[PDB]
Amino acid sequence: MDIKELHVKTVKRGENVTMECSMSKVKDKNKLAWYRQSFGKVPQYFVRYYSSNSGYKFAEGFKDSRFSMTVNDQKFDLNIIGTREDDGGEYFCGEVEGNTIKFTSGTRLQF
Amino acid sequence: DIKELHVKTVKRGENVTMECSMSKVKDKNKLAWYRQSFGKVPQYFVRYYSSNSGYKFAEGFKDSRFSMTVNDQKFDLNIIGTREDDGGEYFCGEVEGNTIKFTSGTRLQF
């Protein structure tokens, strides 16, 4: 499989951010999720597709109202309103396919 | 559930072993290492496999420098003769239904 570049986004505090993932090549939407990796930590499952109008469900424990998603037939996009230093890290969009996950997109959010 | 990566600083030629535990694994068939080269999307690297070696490297990663130590306790990733292009972050995770759970990872830096 071909190596893919992270999108590198340099943001200021208070900026609003969108990190992109495409529905285009998704086989099973139920298996699709974003992963958040704080620097020097193991990545964590962050939010997944959900069969609702909003289209997503955050992992348990996670409440930060600043995070949401734009989910439709084309997009599985991750949004932050009023970004701050704590948000910094790498975010990966991946779809589970049998024994493994395949990541189709990722963004490094930095200040 | 939040875990720190092991940080390892190496020079060219050094041998490395990056650890992952079997202890809490539910389905070994869904267990794999993922390699993320710096600035790149993570990639499936090697998975558990029922065999004498106990693993199978992904199509793009058949370098003889890579191996694993797999037993009832260990799911450890080895590189002999590391090089700068091996630099990045390696994550060990098990697929559980709709998502993957990563239990350990190492940052390999030069």
Side-chain angles (χ1 to χ4, degrees):
Chain A
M1 59 165 55
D2 287 354
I3 195 83
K4 312 293 172 199
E5 290 253 78
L6 294 174
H7 303 95
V8 180
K9 280 179 168 69
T10 310
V11 296
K12 289 168 192 204
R13 204 261 272 284
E15 198 176 325
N16 296 337
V17 187
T18 305
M19 297 178 269
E20 283 177 58
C21 190
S22 181
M23 287 300 198
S24 288
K25 314 160 159 36
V26 174
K27 288 66 60 199
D28 185 350
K29 283 170 187 189
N30 295 307
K31 305 293 184 74
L32 187 67
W34 279 94
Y35 293 80
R36 182 173 169 185
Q37 182 201 16
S38 294
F39 187 88
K41 306 304 180 139
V42 177
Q44 208 112 136
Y45 155 53
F46 191 50
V47 50
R48 62 185 173 93
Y49 175 85
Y50 193 76
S51 303
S52 67
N53 287 3
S54 60
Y56 61 95
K57 190 194 270 180
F58 281 90
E60 272 317 307
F62 190 83
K63 32 204 74 264
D64 182 339
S65 151
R66 294 179 307 116
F67 286 87
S68 68
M69 290 199 71
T70 299
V71 177
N72 52 57
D73 286 339
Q74 298 74 47
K75 294 323 286 293
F76 189 65
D77 291 353
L78 181 66
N79 307 126
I80 303 168
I81 301 170
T83 194
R84 73 268 292 251
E85 283 74 6
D86 275 346
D87 296 332
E90 296 181 355
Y91 293 77
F92 314 124
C93 184
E95 177 181 358
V96 169
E97 317 183 346
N99 295 148
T100 58
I101 190 164
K102 92 115 159 37
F103 293 104
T104 63
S105 200
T107 290
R108 179 184 304 159
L109 190 57
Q110 63 180 30
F111 290 75
Chain B
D1 54 1
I2 150 162
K3 288 101 182 69
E4 303 271 0
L5 299 172
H6 186 241
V7 179
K8 182 167 191 70
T9 301
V10 293
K11 297 184 325 304
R12 187 187 309 150
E14 295 183 352
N15 301 333
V16 301
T17 295
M18 293 177 274
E19 294 176 338
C20 186
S21 179
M22 282 299 193
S23 65
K24 240 34 203 56
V25 173
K26 303 201 193 77
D27 187 349
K28 288 171 184 197
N29 294 307
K30 295 187 173 72
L31 186 69
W33 281 95
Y34 294 80
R35 179 182 83 166
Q36 190 202 6
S37 299
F38 291 124
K40 308 292 187 173
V41 179
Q43 296 190 298
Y44 153 55
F45 193 53
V46 52
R47 69 184 168 100
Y48 173 87
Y49 193 71
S50 290
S51 60
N52 282 43
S53 60
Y55 61 87
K56 170 92 66 27
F57 277 81
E59 189 173 72
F61 300 116
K62 298 291 194 184
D63 193 334
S64 60
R65 291 177 317 122
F66 310 151
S67 64
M68 295 200 73
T69 297
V70 180
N71 58 40
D72 288 324
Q73 295 83 55
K74 307 253 235 220
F75 189 62
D76 290 354
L77 177 59
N78 311 127
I79 303 170
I80 301 306
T82 196
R83 276 191 319 256
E84 287 82 350
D85 52 287
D86 298 315
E89 300 182 341
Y90 295 75
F91 316 124
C92 187
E94 186 190 348
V95 168
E96 57 179 26
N98 293 150
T99 61
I100 183 162
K101 213 256 204 295
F102 295 110
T103 62
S104 66
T106 297
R107 184 160 95 240
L108 197 55
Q109 41 181 48
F110 293 73

